[PDB]
Symmetry: D3
Subunit: 227 residues, 6 copies
Amino acid sequence: NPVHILAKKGEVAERVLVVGDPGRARLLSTLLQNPKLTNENRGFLVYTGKYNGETVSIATHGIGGPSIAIVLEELAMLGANVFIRYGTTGALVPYINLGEYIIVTGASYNQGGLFYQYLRDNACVASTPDFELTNKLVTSFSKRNLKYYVGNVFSSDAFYAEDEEFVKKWSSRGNIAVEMECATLFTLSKVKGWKSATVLVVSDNLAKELEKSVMDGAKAVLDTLTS
Amino acid sequence: NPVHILAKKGEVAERVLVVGDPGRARLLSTLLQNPKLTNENRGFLVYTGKYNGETVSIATHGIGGPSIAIVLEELAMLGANVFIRYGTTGALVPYINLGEYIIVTGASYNQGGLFYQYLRDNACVASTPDFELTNKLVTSFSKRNLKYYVGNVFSSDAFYAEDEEFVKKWSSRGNIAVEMECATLFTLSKVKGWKSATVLVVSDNLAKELEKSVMDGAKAVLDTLTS
Amino acid sequence: NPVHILAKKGEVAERVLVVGDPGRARLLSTLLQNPKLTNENRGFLVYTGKYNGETVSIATHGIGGPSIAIVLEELAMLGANVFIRYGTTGALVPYINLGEYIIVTGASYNQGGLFYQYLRDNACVASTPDFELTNKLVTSFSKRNLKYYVGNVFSSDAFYAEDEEFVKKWSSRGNIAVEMECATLFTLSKVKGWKSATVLVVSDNLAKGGIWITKEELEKSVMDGAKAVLDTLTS
Amino acid sequence: NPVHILAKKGEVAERVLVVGDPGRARLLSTLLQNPKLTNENRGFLVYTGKYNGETVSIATHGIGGPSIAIVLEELAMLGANVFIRYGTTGALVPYINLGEYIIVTGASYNQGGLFYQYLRDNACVASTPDFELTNKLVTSFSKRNLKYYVGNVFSSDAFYAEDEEFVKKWSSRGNIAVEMECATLFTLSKVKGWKSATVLVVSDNLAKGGIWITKEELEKSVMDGAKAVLDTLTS
Amino acid sequence: NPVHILAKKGEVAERVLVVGDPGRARLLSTLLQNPKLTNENRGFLVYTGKYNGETVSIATHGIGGPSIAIVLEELAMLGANVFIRYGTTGALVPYINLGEYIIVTGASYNQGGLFYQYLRDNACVASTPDFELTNKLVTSFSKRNLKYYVGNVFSSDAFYAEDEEFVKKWSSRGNIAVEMECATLFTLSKVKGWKSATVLVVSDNLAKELEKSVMDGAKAVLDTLTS
Amino acid sequence: NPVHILAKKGEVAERVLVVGDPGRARLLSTLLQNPKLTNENRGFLVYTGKYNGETVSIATHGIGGPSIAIVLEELAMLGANVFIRYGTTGALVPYINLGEYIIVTGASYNQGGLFYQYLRDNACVASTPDFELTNKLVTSFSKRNLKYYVGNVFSSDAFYAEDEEFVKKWSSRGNIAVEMECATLFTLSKVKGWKSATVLVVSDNLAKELEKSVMDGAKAVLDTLTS
Ligand SMILES: Nc1ncnc2c1ncn2[C@@H]1O[C@H](CO)[C@@H](O)[C@H]1O
Ligand SMILES: Nc1ncnc2c1ncn2[C@@H]1O[C@H](CO)[C@@H](O)[C@H]1O
Ligand SMILES: Nc1ncnc2c1ncn2[C@@H]1O[C@H](CO)[C@@H](O)[C@H]1O
Ligand SMILES: Nc1ncnc2c1ncn2[C@@H]1O[C@H](CO)[C@@H](O)[C@H]1O
């Protein structure tokens, strides 16, 4: 029995759009038909409504692997099995501009903690999203003529430990942006059998309005989610 | 400049009581004189008021090491340097009862992400609270005739990876309870030069109402913070 | 200058089909127009010719991460920058039949050795193939009406290492097959800037040792797949 | 049965003051009433007598984690369960003068063999002394008007290992001194169920190699502190 | 049934000289009496014949730990139990000249996959050759009046990641040369009960005629194997 | 200036026989000509005298890697450069009887602090003795008709954590006995340029005359040191 998200079974859809910021969940709920607040416990706002004749929920996951792991596990216990994370990220390469999008194809991460507790050892398990769902995202973002890039990201655990040596190291490893929850989402999804994907809004560039960019892409994500 | 906690510098006190649940922050603010909401961005509610002739803030830190690390770093950037975490925990031994308290003397943890990024290697740095501040807590709880225990806790990163083997392993290692933020709080405080401590309310017992226990202990915590 | 693959300037194409078995490299070369043996030093056979009127090369990479790492580095020094591995694999799930194909989307691996020397620490860098090239492969195989599955694989370093929980461990982690070079191929490519992808022919099923197939049916599978792969490299 | 400390039933007290130097164990035994040598095998001297009308023992633990682990395990088999280590240390901060004292609140350490063998994995288990016993030491030292500091220490395994940033590294991590046995003492105690604490006499300052102390002044410091320690052990 | 070395049962000797290069195996087979090619699959050439009235085989092992592991395992399944590797190496000390020989007494290695899969943990198991067999090699080489040095070598997994800082680091760790298969050979042999050793021909010096060297040594090696 | 071994410069020989037990050091000193005690500090007894027309020292190293490292370092600062450890060990194979000897060819060890502090990373550096010195030991024990076995040993750090699962694990990894200082001695010697070896007396057999045995062996050891 979930102890963080206090929604009743049947109040959470199988399809869920997950965001870190409670405020974004509230803003994006205005895109659903007849949205209802199914949970507010511990600040994790969850809204359930309709979109393209499909029931969908928008849920808050907070910051970090431990936080999103808990939210995903409990949403799953209430019926969810398809998740698409819509967050913000810091670009690691110069050519990507603010307000543009990144569709994630994989996540790099440092071993330990959460991963050791779930996997039982330090093996580097491929942290990747569902192949088909990610391709649908690309197709959806193209249909809407939105500027996007496709690549891997580094899921950091320490926001304030990202210096300059940091940027060169990670971009030289094939990552084009940094965020904090993708590796946990993809890996846990692989173990639990959930279908997940992620699209990010570039809010900063470490190598070198948000709300407007957020709204445009949210519609592309919702279309993908309900397709 | 902080991008999560949007409080104006000067609106955050040097002394801060930190809690994981936004709802508890709101509930505990009623114990302050003339409380003002100084931040609500991303759901991290921060209240600032007075207590026993001292300015004090009550801040939300969310769940997990990555989350509290961000909140502490930003509160510190706004002026804070003394932190006392007041959370909930699951007892790992049979004799501790629900509603009783645990004053923390140390935190065990699994190596990984956050710690590697801050410490730069995998050394096991002693994750302990400020000695003087912790003794003051013990004195305050005794004065108010509250039932407490003193011991180490295990700071877990995966709430849903805690099985049977789990309880015996950690209690046999000298830990009497499990929570998720103490190790990050103590270690980062040692590195940043902050004075930190922690008191926990037992909400569950893994070996074998909350609001009531929470309110009683909050006063002892605030007395300690303003002494 | 390369000390294993002794090829001269302009003899290696930019686009290369890489396989572990030199016997297969020779066999596949017969699908090209006027194939020329560019290298045979240390057994690493490399042929260069044309397909659909396009210049391409087929090279041998041997067994394991250390071997394919050396071959990829020297081939790139000779001018290559696009690599598609075409090999064999063992399925980790019961529903995949022998002779079918697996288009790789990522590779799991145990930390250490080669990765520590190249990456300088033990971070788990995402080991994935080029997004676009992989989708081209999916398109090519479906147009050839071939049966394939899409998923991650575990790149093992010890073919004969015992683990009474092997199949269950890796299959429970999202992997549908096991081989030995993909992690090295994908990670080294991300670090060096090469575009890589991988397609594997199921030559055995570890989750069901009851099934089997003969070379007549296997080589047949290898041949049909090579055509789809070559189409993609020439696209 | 113990194979290092050859003592009989009842020769070892429940409360034990442990020191690394057998020469110090002998010297300190003169503070007890009717001291009796209960062991001398392998150089690990153990004396048993009375202080303030209380039976206690002073034992030698040698240098390093592996050594003190063996000694503590055998002393416990002989009946001991309360241990207070009293040793020497090197300060990692400039403001601590030689001859002063450090009451340990925790110990930092590098993952390693000893801990892996006992813990069965590499988790960073909190290495802390008994809360109450440590507070008794603080009270005792202040009542004897002695200058002390409270803080964490780094338990090193390599006295002569080179590290250009040693002092800066550990002091920046909240440690004010370095020694070699505390982490093993605290962790093994938590695991076995013993009550332990530690008090150290600063015999050098790595953050200031300029200051020095003479043997007469030092032993003087050791003597004074030992009284406070013994008061606590017999409280 | 071995899937790489398809030699017939009885076609592989108990005594085996292993080399990484197929061409060297071919070239060395001319030192045997009545040599017959017993395997060609996957390029792993294996020849079997006689020398000093004893049956002996010369096998190709390819490049790297994973490759030699497979070959050794299958050769053993076919009856081999004594292995002597004859390869090339890069000197890490300036006093060793090209063409001279190095008789290995131990192998340094970085912890990694292969060792983890076979050992089941990160323990540093001593990677050493058979003591008696190694002394027989020393005798054979001095008897033929050859110039050799006895010492430890570093078994690298990444040929193209061995920069300059490389030389100082490994030479200061007691290693006088670098190659890529010795650690695997020695450790696997200790676990399986095989008797192994290694002699190397210096083909390069990273701190600072050939054909003849290879041939000269091969004869000293064959005498040892058949002693 | 060494702070543990207070011997005067010139009072310590270049050739040193090291033992863990102070009592054995005292006992073995009677084998030297005109033995003089050169150090007593901290219980680390050191005697110096002559044997076969050569200056030799017998030093106490205490128990464990950290202890022998300190002693070896200070003895070297005083002029020692050739070390031969003579200790006791527990056999890991049933065919080795009490009182017999084991000449060590290598040492297995678990990654740990001491090796990390000296090596600066987790690399498994070959922990082996000097090849020449070890062969001289074999010769010495043969000329005296003593029963010995050559093989690798496991250098444990936790004496009281050596259960039964223990025996099968290390014996299957090619180790024939367990002790506590060889890994440290061999690795530190390789890094420092010292020549070291080790002979052990089997005191116990975990798979299934300490006076007389020790004495008989010590003589073979002293002959080797002065050859
Ligand atoms: N520069 C950045 N580094 C790490 N996370 C970032 C960054 N920019 C945005 N984020 C994302 O936004 C939140 C932190 O602001 C986290 O949930 C994280 O996923
Ligand atoms: N059983 C438990 N395991 C881990 N954290 C717990 C437990 N009970 C309460 N907590 C604390 O409460 C939150 C999760 O409920 C986290 O912030 C954590 O610190
Ligand atoms: N400098 C070197 N570094 C690594 N391996 C080498 C070197 N020189 C020769 N080799 C050996 O030759 C092959 C690499 O050319 C491998 O099988 C390896 O054992
Ligand atoms: N069974 C054993 N396990 C570990 N060390 C042993 C054993 N037998 C003898 N020793 C050696 O003797 C001492 C422990 O009695 C240590 O110095 C160690 O090297």
